[PDB]
Design a protein around this ligand. Sequence first.
Ligand SMILES: [Zn+2]
Ligand SMILES: [Zn+2]
Ligand SMILES: [Zn+2]
Length: 178
Amino acid sequence: NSNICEVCNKWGRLFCCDTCPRSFHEHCHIPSVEANKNPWSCIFCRIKTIQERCPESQSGHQESEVLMRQMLPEEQLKCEFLLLKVYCDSKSCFFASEPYYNREGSQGPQKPMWLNKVKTSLNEQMYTRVEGFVQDMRLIFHNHKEFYREDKFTRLGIQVQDIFEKNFRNIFAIQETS
Ligand SMILES: [Zn+2]
Ligand SMILES: [Zn+2]
Ligand SMILES: [Zn+2]
């Protein structure tokens, strides 16, 4: 196994996957690393199994159909993995915890949103469709763009949103376009 967490790239108290060489901090893995279960298989492994059991699941999809899917177990897992892929980027630090807004010339968003809040919402099964999860994720970056206006710090929103969108298109096998 790796000697650093796959998500945050730090050492510490790691749990090791039994079916691949990745390791995780307890609360870096999503869902949080399960108490027992020997062998234990990480989210990367579980996602690969879905694809292997149904190879046609990689054929192209329309985003509009993906968003209307109910959050059954497989869609729940895919959203968890997409959330995890965002946390994997170190720039996710800026969007993880509850923000506050006091900048001359700007007003805070009407509906603040942050990664840990999405994490809790997934954990508590608060989303009934994929659309719920994707809307909250995109709201994080949209709030950031609007608040920071012409400050160059707006670019962090652009950057982390691009990670989100690339991973959304990969995980849900969105039909490639020009
Ligand atoms: Zn970690
Ligand atoms: Zn694994
Ligand atoms: Zn099949």
